[PDB]
């Protein structure tokens, strides 16, 4: 409900070109993100991070973009302990988008340590279609950043895929 | 088959083999036209995902335009079959290439379809999809400068 109203501000702000509506929506969305982080709401966090990225993609808000990189690190953490393959896949995929758009080396190195666990989550779940996505995500991680222990992990996983 | 085309794109992207990705591009251009003939829209979305992946590394303009061409064909089949989950994927993907390449043709195709595509989401009652679909309409009307579309997404936004 609080998220539905924030979405009502982003949609109207991105329509009328109201730079003040996006400034208020991004500030409320940054605060709302820290709220659902303590509640463990993964489903609503997927929509909040989707709205945050959509705002920063249009107005170039590096502040809201950097804040999204921090909460996506914590939101991806909750998905891994919850063994949620579909949420961990969307979370890590969007994390690469923020890693590529913002050039954050911290979020890139964080993906290097978790890609071994997200891919194993897809292998443990048996979803080969969802695995091919995560295996491709591991290739993009080793391509953009110097991955010494990840490049040999995704390579061996492709043969067994 | 997409299952082996997947194996070539992943191996070429990982080892940097430009000839390997080139070989997948010829197979993708032939597999996409066949996937549209069969009507497999779930598999075509995977081939489209692979097509825009090899093109955004090898710098392919012919295959990317071919992927943008079968997107317009797959969107019509998704509209004739009321496949809301597909039509939302084809349209949202069409905006991806139209934004990075500035293709005025792909943007103009999206103005006429976003009306019938949004109406497909409101008819099914999927409130979680039309909100994504409405956002697709704003970028269509804002980035392409559409006057008749700006009033359409606004009128649908007030009814939310």
């Amino acid at each position: 409900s609080m998220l539905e109203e924030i979405e009502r501000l982003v949609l109207s702000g991105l329509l009328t070109g109201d730079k003040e509506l996006l400034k208020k929506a991004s500030e409320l969305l940054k605060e709302e993100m820290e709220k659902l982080l303590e509640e463990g709401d993964l489903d609503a966090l997927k929509k909040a991070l989707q709205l945050a990225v959509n705002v920063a993609d249009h107005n170039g808000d590096k502040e809201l973009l950097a804040h999204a990189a921090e909460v996506i690190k914590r939101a991806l953490d909750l998905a891994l302990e919850a063994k949620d393959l579909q949420s961990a896949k969307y979370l890590a995929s969007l994390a690469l988008w923020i890693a590529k758009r913002a050039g954050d080396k911290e979020l890139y190195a964080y993906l290097e340590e978790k890609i071994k666990k997200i891919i194993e989550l897809a292998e443990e779940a048996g979803d080969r279609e969802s695995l091919k996505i995560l295996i491709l995500l591991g290739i993009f991680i080793a391509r953009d950043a110097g991955s010494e222990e990840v490049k040999a992990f995704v390579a061996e996983q492709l043969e067994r895929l | 088959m997409l299952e082996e085309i997947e194996r070539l794109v992943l191996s070429g992207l990982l080892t940097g083999d430009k000839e390997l990705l080139k070989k997948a591009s010829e197979l993708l251009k032939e597999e996409m036209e066949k996937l549209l003939e069969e009507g497999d829209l779930d598999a075509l979305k995977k081939a489209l995902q692979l097509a825009v992946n090899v093109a955004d590394h090898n710098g392919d303009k012919e295959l990317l335009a071919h992927a943008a061409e079968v997107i317009k064909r797959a969107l019509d089949l998704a509209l004739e079959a009321k496949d809301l989950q597909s039509a939302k994927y084809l349209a949202s993907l069409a905006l991806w290439i139209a934004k990075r390449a500035g293709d005025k043709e792909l943007y103009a195709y999206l103005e006429e379809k976003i009306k019938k595509i949004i109406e497909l989401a409101e008819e099914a009652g999927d409130r979680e999809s039309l909100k994504i679909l409405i956002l697709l309409g704003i970028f269509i009307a804002r980035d392409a400068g559409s006057e008749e579309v700006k009033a359409f997404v606004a009128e649908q936004l007030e009814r939310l």
């Binding site: 959509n54 995929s93 | 995902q49 994927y89």
Partner: peptide
């Protein structure tokens, strides 16, 4: 997704 959706 790798890439497409709004975004994902």
């Amino acid at each position: 997704x790798l890439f497409x959706x709004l975004f994902x």
